[PDB]
């Protein structure tokens, strides 16, 4: 692609610059380019990838919801046309990310910390597709997300401690999937409570710095449980 001629390390440097400048489309373009060099990513490099695309797709999702709500209220073609335009861009980004995970990040990820991170991302980007799906593939999209999340969960439960931030962020996300996408609110609540309680019981093993990382995500679980119960 367009980043083919730039050095892997230069792309990573520039992703970090872009992040500081709040230039998240540039950030995502640079990390895409880094990924396409074909080497595995470090922990920090995985984080840069996720943050970039998360920021990009976040703007799209928020814009989609504004438009969709206006469209719902109105029920000429402009509102639907423009909502369709934003939706198609959002779908494009999700497709791009899924593309990177399938070609070939997931298949080369053997470590629990890499594998679970990528499979969570897979579940997330299918979840983003699900939020805007109304067609005959809606069910398959949902099952793709569920399947990605579950494989991640199984690995995380066998291979990581209950306080592992990756495992925690996966469970948070999978619980919201359950609540909101799968229409399984009891499953959502059950997962979020179990996850919180098992984390709680493992905190005693952590350094002050690990303690802060874990409890931050645990508080997110708590926030959702408060809304849900």
């Amino acid at each position: 692609g367009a980043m083919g001629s730039m050095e892997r390390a230069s792309l990573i440097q520039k992703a970090k610059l872009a992040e500081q400048a709040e230039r998240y489309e540039d950030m995502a373009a640079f990390m895409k380019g880094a990924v396409e060099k074909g080497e595995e990513l470090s922990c920090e490099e995985r984080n840069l990838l996720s943050v970039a695309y998360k920021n990009v797709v976040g703007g799209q999702r928020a814009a989609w919801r504004v438009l969709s709500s206006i469209e719902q209220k109105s029920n000429g073609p402009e509102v639907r046309e423009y909502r369709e335009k934003v939706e198609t861009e959002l779908q494009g980004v999700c497709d791009t990310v899924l593309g990177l995970l399938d070609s070939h990040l997931i298949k080369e990820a053997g470590d629990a910390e890499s594998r679970v991170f990528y499979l969570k991302m897979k579940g997330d980007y299918y979840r983003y597709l699900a939020e805007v799906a109304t067609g005959d593939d809606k069910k398959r999209i949902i099952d793709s997300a569920r399947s990605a999340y579950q494989e991640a969960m199984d690995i995380s439960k066998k291979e990581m401690p209950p306080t592992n931030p990756i495992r925690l962020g996966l469970a948070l996300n999978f619980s919201v999937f359950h609540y909101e996408i799968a229409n399984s609110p009891e499953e959502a609540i059950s997962l979020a409570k179990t996850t919180f309680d098992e984390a709680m019981a493992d905190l005693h093993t952590l350094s002050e710095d690990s303690y802060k990382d874990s409890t931050l995500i645990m508080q997110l679980l708590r926030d959702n449980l408060t809304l849900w119960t």
């Binding site: 976040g58 919801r65 709500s69 996966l170 948070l172 996300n173 919201v176 997110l220 959702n224 809304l227």
Partner: peptide
């Protein structure tokens, strides 16, 4: 839309 907490940035 009431959005629930999910991992990472907004």
């Amino acid at each position: 839309k009431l959005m629930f907490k999910t991992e990472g940035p907004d």
